[PDB]
Design an enzyme around this catalytic site. Sequence first.
Site, mmCIF file in Angstrom:
data_model
loop_
_atom_site.group_PDB
_atom_site.id
_atom_site.type_symbol
_atom_site.label_atom_id
_atom_site.label_comp_id
_atom_site.label_asym_id
_atom_site.label_seq_id
_atom_site.Cartn_x
_atom_site.Cartn_y
_atom_site.Cartn_z
ATOM 1 N N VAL A 26 0.857 -1.182 0.000
ATOM 2 C CA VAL A 26 0.000 0.000 0.000
ATOM 3 C C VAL A 26 0.896 1.236 0.000
ATOM 4 O O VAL A 26 0.729 2.148 -0.814
ATOM 5 C CB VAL A 26 -0.950 0.010 1.215
ATOM 6 C CG1 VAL A 26 -1.621 1.366 1.386
ATOM 7 C CG2 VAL A 26 -2.000 -1.082 1.081
ATOM 8 N N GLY A 27 1.843 1.279 0.927
ATOM 9 C CA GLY A 27 2.792 2.365 0.934
ATOM 10 C C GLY A 27 3.798 2.233 2.037
ATOM 11 O O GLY A 27 3.724 1.343 2.882
ATOM 12 N N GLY A 29 6.746 4.926 4.334
ATOM 13 C CA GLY A 29 7.258 6.258 4.587
ATOM 14 C C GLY A 29 7.852 6.296 5.973
ATOM 15 O O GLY A 29 8.233 5.259 6.520
ATOM 16 N N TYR A 31 6.331 6.618 8.639
ATOM 17 C CA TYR A 31 5.416 5.778 9.437
ATOM 18 C C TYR A 31 5.724 4.284 9.526
ATOM 19 O O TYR A 31 5.038 3.575 10.286
ATOM 20 C CB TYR A 31 3.964 5.926 8.930
ATOM 21 C CG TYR A 31 3.699 5.628 7.455
ATOM 22 C CD1 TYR A 31 3.447 4.313 6.990
ATOM 23 C CD2 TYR A 31 3.643 6.669 6.522
ATOM 24 C CE1 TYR A 31 3.186 4.072 5.638
ATOM 25 C CE2 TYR A 31 3.385 6.428 5.176
ATOM 26 C CZ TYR A 31 3.160 5.133 4.734
ATOM 27 O OH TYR A 31 2.901 4.953 3.378
ATOM 28 N N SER A 33 5.704 0.797 7.098
ATOM 29 C CA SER A 33 5.175 0.298 5.841
ATOM 30 C C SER A 33 3.792 -0.265 6.057
ATOM 31 O O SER A 33 3.484 -0.768 7.140
ATOM 32 C CB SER A 33 6.092 -0.771 5.259
ATOM 33 O OG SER A 33 7.359 -0.213 4.999
ATOM 34 N N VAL A 34 2.972 -0.181 5.016
ATOM 35 C CA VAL A 34 1.618 -0.719 5.067
ATOM 36 C C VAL A 34 1.393 -1.620 3.876
ATOM 37 O O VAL A 34 1.789 -1.287 2.748
ATOM 38 C CB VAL A 34 0.543 0.387 5.056
ATOM 39 C CG1 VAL A 34 -0.874 -0.210 5.077
ATOM 40 C CG2 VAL A 34 0.741 1.309 6.236
ATOM 41 N N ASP A 164 -5.560 9.572 11.953
ATOM 42 C CA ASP A 164 -4.457 10.484 12.329
ATOM 43 C C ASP A 164 -3.299 10.377 11.331
ATOM 44 O O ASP A 164 -2.153 10.740 11.621
ATOM 45 C CB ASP A 164 -4.027 10.304 13.797
ATOM 46 C CG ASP A 164 -3.677 8.880 14.144
ATOM 47 O OD1 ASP A 164 -3.639 8.044 13.230
ATOM 48 O OD2 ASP A 164 -3.450 8.592 15.338
HETATM 49 C C1 LIG Z 1 -3.874 1.702 12.807
HETATM 50 C C2 LIG Z 1 -3.417 1.274 11.438
HETATM 51 C C3 LIG Z 1 -3.037 2.235 10.530
HETATM 52 C C4 LIG Z 1 -2.641 1.833 9.257
HETATM 53 C C5 LIG Z 1 -2.180 2.812 8.262
HETATM 54 N N1 LIG Z 1 -1.136 3.608 8.521
HETATM 55 C C6 LIG Z 1 -0.901 4.352 7.464
HETATM 56 C C7 LIG Z 1 0.077 5.339 7.224
HETATM 57 C C8 LIG Z 1 0.071 5.943 6.008
HETATM 58 C C9 LIG Z 1 -0.850 5.600 5.007
HETATM 59 N N2 LIG Z 1 -1.768 4.701 5.244
HETATM 60 N N3 LIG Z 1 -1.811 4.049 6.477
HETATM 61 C C10 LIG Z 1 -2.632 3.057 6.963
HETATM 62 C C11 LIG Z 1 -3.777 2.496 6.218
HETATM 63 C C12 LIG Z 1 -4.870 1.912 6.890
HETATM 64 C C13 LIG Z 1 -5.939 1.427 6.164
HETATM 65 N N4 LIG Z 1 -5.966 1.525 4.844
HETATM 66 C C14 LIG Z 1 -4.978 2.098 4.156
HETATM 67 N N5 LIG Z 1 -5.140 2.161 2.776
HETATM 68 C C15 LIG Z 1 -4.499 2.952 1.883
HETATM 69 O O1 LIG Z 1 -3.626 3.746 2.194
HETATM 70 C C16 LIG Z 1 -4.914 2.805 0.472
HETATM 71 C C17 LIG Z 1 -4.737 3.841 -0.467
HETATM 72 C C18 LIG Z 1 -5.167 3.634 -1.770
HETATM 73 N N6 LIG Z 1 -5.747 2.486 -2.114
HETATM 74 O O2 LIG Z 1 -6.168 2.335 -3.461
HETATM 75 C C19 LIG Z 1 -5.937 1.484 -1.260
HETATM 76 C C20 LIG Z 1 -6.602 0.193 -1.683
HETATM 77 C C21 LIG Z 1 -5.528 1.613 0.054
HETATM 78 C C22 LIG Z 1 -3.857 2.608 4.816
HETATM 79 C C23 LIG Z 1 -2.576 0.467 8.918
HETATM 80 C C24 LIG Z 1 -2.961 -0.494 9.835
HETATM 81 C C25 LIG Z 1 -3.369 -0.083 11.097
HETATM 82 F F1 LIG Z 1 -3.754 -1.008 11.989
#
Ligand SMILES: Cc1cc(-c2nc3cccnn3c2-c2ccnc(NC(=O)c3cc[n+]([O-])c(C)c3)c2)ccc1F
Length: 338
Positions: A26-27, A29, A31, A33-34, A164
């Site tokens: 997903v990404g 940074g 933070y 990785s996800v 957040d």
């Molecule tokens: C508490 C917790 C937080 C995060 C989490 N942390 C971060 C930091 C930066 C960015 N994202 N992020 C996420 C997170 C949580 C849900 N979903 C997405 N999804 C997309 O970013 C996305 C973007 C476009 N598309 O097309 C899709 C399918 C998913 C990120 C993950 C797990 C968790 F248990």
Amino acid sequence: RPTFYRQELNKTIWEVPERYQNLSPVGSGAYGSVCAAFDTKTGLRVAVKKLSRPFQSIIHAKRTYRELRLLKHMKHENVIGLLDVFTPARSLEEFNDVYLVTHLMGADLNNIVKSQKLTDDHVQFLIYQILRGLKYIHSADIIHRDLKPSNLAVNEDSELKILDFGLARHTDDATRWYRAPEIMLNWHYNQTVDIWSVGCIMAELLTGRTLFPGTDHIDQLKLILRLVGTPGAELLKKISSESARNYIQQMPKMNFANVFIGANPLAVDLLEKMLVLDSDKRITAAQALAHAYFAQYHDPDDEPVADPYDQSFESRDLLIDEWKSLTYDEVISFVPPP
Ligand SMILES: Cc1cc(-c2nc3cccnn3c2-c2ccnc(NC(=O)c3cc[n+]([O-])c(C)c3)c2)ccc1F
């Protein structure tokens, strides 16, 4: 204990219980990785976050504990929470990585809006949910402080969660615009700094345009004060600093009915109550939920508050292994939601 497996994604090594299948990036940074995954136990699509260097330093360790404590406490439909937290470690002595699991989210408020006016009924529903989540967050004596459309996840049912963090941008794809003026000016502030942000968001959803698109910090304040007026006498009496009083000071408040032309009069009235310069007079989340604008959604018996949130750890100066052990306790005591 579940069986774990190992997988490399975007050059980050993941060690996860077998229930999480089909890992995809997903990404990544600052933070960590996800990844996205399929949770075979629940049938849910989930996001799994691997924290970056969680116990590298006292500060990282305290940050990790803070993050886990908060996430464990946040149990509300409109606030991001935890489905799971795990570590491949079998003991405190092995404990070096923390993985967090939540629902996979694919779109934020900017993605739903796309620089377009939303219908008034759609605005009611979205802002209702933001305020419902904020009532809960504020009841835990937490201030979000950085509320903006990128921190608001919205699914295809327009169900909304306050985050957040911002979601990861696809590889093939300002914050200040939503900040309360008292933060911009460095003035004591209250939870209604978040209500300011909501008013900014609501204005934008209704009009299709950023309310206060300042080019820089000074411009931002100028745009704000043109709408909400220079401080009145009652507000000036509350400014302790001579220089601060000498600085902020020259136009009166605009009539929002003449700004938000064609909007629902109840929306205009709510915006007037959210976008007050004096934060002592700004409507609270609870008060806002009871506003007539939300009459089709408001249910005073289904706008819950949080349990009291013990944040006394914030005042403590502990060693890495202490924060690590406290964090490990929190991993072990985790109970998934139903
Ligand atoms: C508490 C917790 C937080 C995060 C989490 N942390 C971060 C930091 C930066 C960015 N994202 N992020 C996420 C997170 C949580 C849900 N979903 C997405 N999804 C997309 O970013 C996305 C973007 C476009 N598309 O097309 C899709 C399918 C998913 C990120 C993950 C797990 C968790 F248990």
